[PDB]
Structure 1
């Protein structure tokens, strides 16, 4: 059943080329350079955050087909992230499509472009995260005018995505926020209704395996003491959020499994002063390496979804698409545009990694 069993995860060359060409030439310490070279080999998801990234998806799948026909057993990992009026609760979104300017039709073409690619590589297992911080905003942010207006477009576009990418080689996980967002007990029943209705309204697609949590966030999987910024939520880590949310989805006909982003949660507690501070958080490290051996029946894999070292947002308040969350004092600064390489942040995640990359473990 688990789409992560039976395969290796591909480490893409977009992140490897970031580390080799941008990061390593800036690092002088020989041990840290070797540690950087190693992290570039940890497989993390490739984000399709514009239409112009879809040729990179096809190139990555072509490389995986080459590797597989040469014996490999790799699967690809991609994030579908280009809804019109994307990031609806921001002061600022980088999304290229607007609902008012043909954005629903542009999203249809974007999904059709990805479906043609996944069908062209029907031999390749393709693991998808669908639309981070979309549906969670329709649970808690209907008070924000852009999100209230985006409700119909988001539900239609999500329904298109999950029905059109319901293919035999795909497993999809709908993004479902994190413990600090939907794990609060008052948010659980409305979120479970919305997610199980998305699944049932798409005719319970076989390929929609479940939900992704902690994407681009920093929560622990399991911690023995709740970090102080989680109080008073009883679901203060992802294990507690998922053990609370899974039976409420199953009660309404969506027997969801989960993947959890551990790419930036190795250091706990984190540097967050408030749990809603999400941008470029100080005091974080790379986490548990991707694996299907999670020790938990509900969790198909620990994965690295947000690629560590790529910025969450610029800290320049005069720049386009600036959001005030990226200038808070627990956000590392100065930070470049969202998605762009942020070398200080990479070095922070490398220094604080747990498990560490600086450990040299090596036998003959």
Structure 2
């Protein structure tokens, strides 16, 4: 289709996240904060498939969404994240991941995608929006000095193209991850990013199902900054809107008229980072701008909550195999559990600090 893929759809509410929120609310003693916590389970989030053992769960969500659709007659849209490349998260320790290129990682990744595809095939009547491999391509632009990233370059591109070709053949709408304003928004990185995204789009066959890009995944940038965050100094693109408005024309000239979705899940509190490159469980974050199709620009299909607030970005335990020093910074919330696991203290702050505030 030509238009906004989200238009006219009810957004399927993650049962995984609802259950986490339900249990989290139960542990909050403040009745006001408890009631606000419970509102969060009604806010649409993206469902991450960060491990291949989760692929059968996609079938379960799509069956559930299909049943809701058939019961109510209201079209359902399921939001998912493809996040399992071999040598994943190559500039960091926190979200390492289960596949290694040293151990048949590439083939195992294709199989992971194939399993995702086999579930989608069983439930063709539900629309799916997928974010493709957060951080992957952003690392390819910026971190070829990092041995793991340099070694992963061919596999990242191959893997992302495979996923895109396989999902596009199933009518899945993809948004390829594109870092954020403080990553690829820098003039050092814009043009090279535009070139890379255009290349992936091309090699993936230029399917109309490849709708565009996703920004600010698991990050904290403002969409449109009322006051400039001191941490953004030197970068003219100091919010996601500016980043996108600088990127979109470049990418267009490079052969792709791309549309955008923006994570605002943990963007409610600005001015909370000592450095812009600090990403791990940043202290005092709040739930941000709610998912909506009323965006400030025609390039932007939707504001979304891609990273589900409350799930950790990485362990702060200096003894743990996945310990990354970003997770030990003075402006990280500590002690933090393993990436992807529930982080109660952190969730409690997101609710309390939410902007706009959550209602009862």
* TM-score class, shorter: over 0.9
Instruction: Map residues 208-223 of structure 1 onto 2, 5 A cutoff.
Output: 208-223=210-225
Which residues of structure 2 form unaligned runs of 5+? none
After TM superposition, give the deviation of residue 3 of structure 1 in Å.
0.5
1:288 equivalent in structure 2: 289
Q: Deviations over 1:46-73 (max 9, x none)?
A: 1000001112211111110010001222
After TM superposition, give the deviation of residue 293 of structure 1 in Å.
1.6
CA-based RMSD of the aligned residues comes to 1.1
Instruction: Map residues 264-279 of structure 1 onto 2, 5 A cutoff.
Output: 264-269=266-271, 271-279=272-280
Question: Is residue 117–residue 170 contact of structure 2 (8 Å, CA) maintained in 1?
Answer: no
2:14 equivalent in structure 1: 12
Instruction: Map residues 68-87 of structure 1 onto 2, 5 A cutoff.
Output: 68-71=69-72, 72-87=74-89
Hey, which bits of structure 1, 4+ residues long, moved more than 6 A? Answer: none
Question: Is residue 77–residue 127 contact of structure 1 (8 Å, CA) maintained in 2?
Answer: yes
Instruction: Map residues 194-213 of structure 1 onto 2, 5 A cutoff.
Output: 194-213=196-215
What is the DSSP-based 3-state SS (H/G/I as helix, E as strand, rest coil) of the residue aligned with 1:127? strand
- Cα distance in 2, alignment partners of residues 65 and 18 from structure 1: 23
Question: Is residue 219–residue 237 contact of structure 1 (8 Å, CA) maintained in 2?
Answer: yes
Which residues of structure 1 form unaligned runs of 5+? none
1:258 equivalent in structure 2: 260
2:191 equivalent in structure 1: 189
1:6–1:188 Cα change, 3 Å: same
- 1:313 and 2:309 are equivalent in the alignment: no
After TM superposition, give the deviation of residue 295 of structure 1 in Å.
3.3
- Cα distance in 1, alignment partners of residues 22 and 228 from structure 2: 37
Q: Deviations over 1:296-331 (max 9, x none)?
A: 101000000000000000000001211111010100
TM-score (norm 1): 0.96
Question: Is residue 175–residue 211 contact of structure 1 (8 Å, CA) maintained in 2?
Answer: yes
What is the DSSP-based 3-state SS (H/G/I as helix, E as strand, rest coil) of the residue aligned with 2:131? strand
Matched residue count: 357
After TM superposition, give the deviation of residue 289 of structure 1 in Å.
1.1
State which of 132, 142, 145 in structure 1 corresponds to 2:144: 142
Q: Deviations over 1:63-114 (max 9, x none)?
A: 1001000122220000000000000111454300001100000001011111
1:91–1:50 Cα change, 3 Å: closer
Question: Is residue 123–residue 169 contact of structure 1 (8 Å, CA) maintained in 2?
Answer: no
